[PDB]
Amino acid sequence: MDVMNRLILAMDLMNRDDALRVTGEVREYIDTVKIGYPLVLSEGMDIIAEFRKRFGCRIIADFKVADIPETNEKICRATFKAGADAIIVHGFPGADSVRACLNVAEEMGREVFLNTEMSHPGAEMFIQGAADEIARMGVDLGVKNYVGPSTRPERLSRLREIIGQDSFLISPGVGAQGGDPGETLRFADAIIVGRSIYLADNPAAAAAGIIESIKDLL
Amino acid sequence: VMDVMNRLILAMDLMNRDDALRVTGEVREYIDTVKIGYPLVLSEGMDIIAEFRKRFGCRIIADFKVADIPETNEKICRATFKAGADAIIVHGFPGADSVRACLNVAEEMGREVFLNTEMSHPGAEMFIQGAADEIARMGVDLGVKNYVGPSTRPERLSRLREIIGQDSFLISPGVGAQGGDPGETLRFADAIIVGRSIYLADNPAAAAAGIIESIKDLL
Numbered sequence: 001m002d003v004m005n006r007l008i009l010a011m012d013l014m015n016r017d018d019a020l021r022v023t024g025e026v027r028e029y030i031d032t033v034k035i036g037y038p039l040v041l042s043e044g045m046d047i048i049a050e051f052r053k054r055f056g057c058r059i060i061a062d063f064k065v066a067d068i069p070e071t072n073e074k075i076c077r078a079t080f081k082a083g084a085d086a087i088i089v090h091g092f093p094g095a096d097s098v099r100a101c102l103n104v105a106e107e108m109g110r111e112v113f114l115n116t117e118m119s120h121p122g123a124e125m126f127i128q129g130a131a132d133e134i135a136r137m138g139v140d141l142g143v144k145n146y147v148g149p150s151t152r153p154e155r156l157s158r159l160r161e162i163i164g165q166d167s168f169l170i171s172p173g174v175g176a177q178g179g180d181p182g183e184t185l186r187f188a189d190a191i192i193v194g195r196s197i198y199l200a201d202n203p204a205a206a207a208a209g210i211i212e213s214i215k216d217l218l
Numbered sequence: 219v220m221d222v223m224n225r226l227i228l229a230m231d232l233m234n235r236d237d238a239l240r241v242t243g244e245v246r247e248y249i250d251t252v253k254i255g256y257p258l259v260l261s262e263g264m265d266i267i268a269e270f271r272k273r274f275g276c277r278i279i280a281d282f283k284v285a286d287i288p289e290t291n292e293k294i295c296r297a298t299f300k301a302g303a304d305a306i307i308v309h310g311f312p313g314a315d316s317v318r319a320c321l322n323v324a325e326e327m328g329r330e331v332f333l334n335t336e337m338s339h340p341g342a343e344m345f346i347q348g349a350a351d352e353i354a355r356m357g358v359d360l361g362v363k364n365y366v367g368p369s370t371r372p373e374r375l376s377r378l379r380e381i382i383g384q385d386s387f388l389i390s391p392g393v394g395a396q397g398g399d400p401g402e403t404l405r406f407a408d409a410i411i412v413g414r415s416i417y418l419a420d421n422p423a424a425a426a427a428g429i430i431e432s433i434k435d436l437l
């Protein structure tokens with residue numbers, strides 16, 4: 001996956017007009033948008049096709065898929081029907097649940113991203129202790145796309161070690177949650193940025209600023 | 219706690235609006251509580267919750283397995299309750315802050331949170347099972363009153379009932395298609411969740427009635 005400027009916009013605004021306007025304001029800087037449940041549950045799955053029509057951007061559906069295999073298959077099918085290029089799935093529910101998603105992605109010509117360790121403080125309770133094993137599970141299953149935490153560069157580096165340089169790694173927690181863009185790109189292929197851009201007085205200048213700060217990494 | 223008719227919750231995971239409505243309507247006399255998940259919501263929109271409320275006298279539990287950071291969890295819960303869901307189901311494996319985010323929105327909005335503790339499918343054995351007792355205890359500590367646990371592992375369902383106590387409300391999926399027994403599950407759960415055994419049956423109403431006949435002495 002070739003992400004413009006190594007920068008993925010997390011579009012978590014919850015109304016269509018604002019989401020479209022802000023995305024339009026930063027369109028020159030990105031070509032990949034992560035759309036999650038905040039926007040989809042507020043405006044419907046048709047918003048994905050709308051983004052594709054307006055911007056041609058790739059769409060990663062951040063749905064943290066975390067059900068039994070049978071339900072996971074249905075969720076992926078509905079998601080790809082809506083035009084998503086990729087879906088993000090949790091590894092904590094185990095290998096069968098991940099495989100269910102890989103099957104549908106293969107059928108519809110899409111990608112699965114595996115979330116290995118999350119960025120927020122609560123990730124320390126249960127997820128962090130399982131994270132290396134979840135990463136190895138991804139490797140065993142043939143997963144090629146991963147998500148790991150900008151807020152813990154040492155853990156992000158370990159995840160990169162496990163999955164290898166061939167795998168694709170994206171990383172949220174940059175900006176609002178405290179992660180640094182350049183440090184994160186030592187290990188991740190691309191950074192995910194939400195509030196630092198979409199809540200900024202001037203989203204375009206915020207994106208431009210982040211890009212300026214990592215210009216030597218592009 | 220919610221008064222679940224016949225201790226039976228329909229898992230409405232058909233992805234077609236016409237079929238979902240038909241089947242739900244056919245079993246309406248047996249079931250006043252419907253679990254709606256992402257298979258149906260992602261296919262037909264959040265307005266499906268509105269349509270079920272309009273058409274049927276049913277409570278709606280939004281099974282969204284909420285599993286994000288606290289800030290995003292808050293947004294998901296707000297949108298879900300705004301749409302008319304009585305309750306939402308959240309994961310505990312992302313930790314206490316993520317659960318608390320959901321509880322806070324539910325408190326503010328006058329709705330309820332269910333916490334998923336151990337899941338019913340084989341893969342749950344890899345990571346979830348080992349965390350499940352602690353996730354349940356965490357729930358108790360956070361003041362969670364409603365829980366989900368697995369019909370497919372009676373021993374685990376029993377332990378989870380112990381941890382959360384008799385006053386807590388416990389619902390349990392994995393009955394029928396996944397191999398769990400209605401009667402045995404109701405030894406520990408307040409209500410059973412049933413999907414395919416009902417919605418894929420030639421006569422969903424007869425399937426529901428048959429489940430209910432099998433547990434008649436437990437009502």
Ligand SMILES: O=c1cc(O)n([C@@H]2O[C@H](COP(=O)(O)O)[C@@H](O)[C@H]2O)c(=O)[nH]1
Nearest residue numbers: 010118119172173176193194195287290
């Ligand atoms: O570990 C993770 C995984 C995520 O997907 N995310 C998501 O990435 C985005 C981060 O947005 P923000 O830059 O506003 O903190 C949100 O959509 C959040 O749900 C995260 O923050 N941490």
Ligand SMILES: O=c1cc(O)n([C@@H]2O[C@H](COP(=O)(O)O)[C@@H](O)[C@H]2O)c(=O)[nH]1
Nearest residue numbers: 068071229337338391392395412413414
């Ligand atoms: O541990 C769990 C938790 C669930 O919510 N579920 C959900 O309960 C329902 C089970 O449906 P069924 O009776 O068709 O197996 C599905 O909606 C599934 O997503 C589950 O099967 N196991």
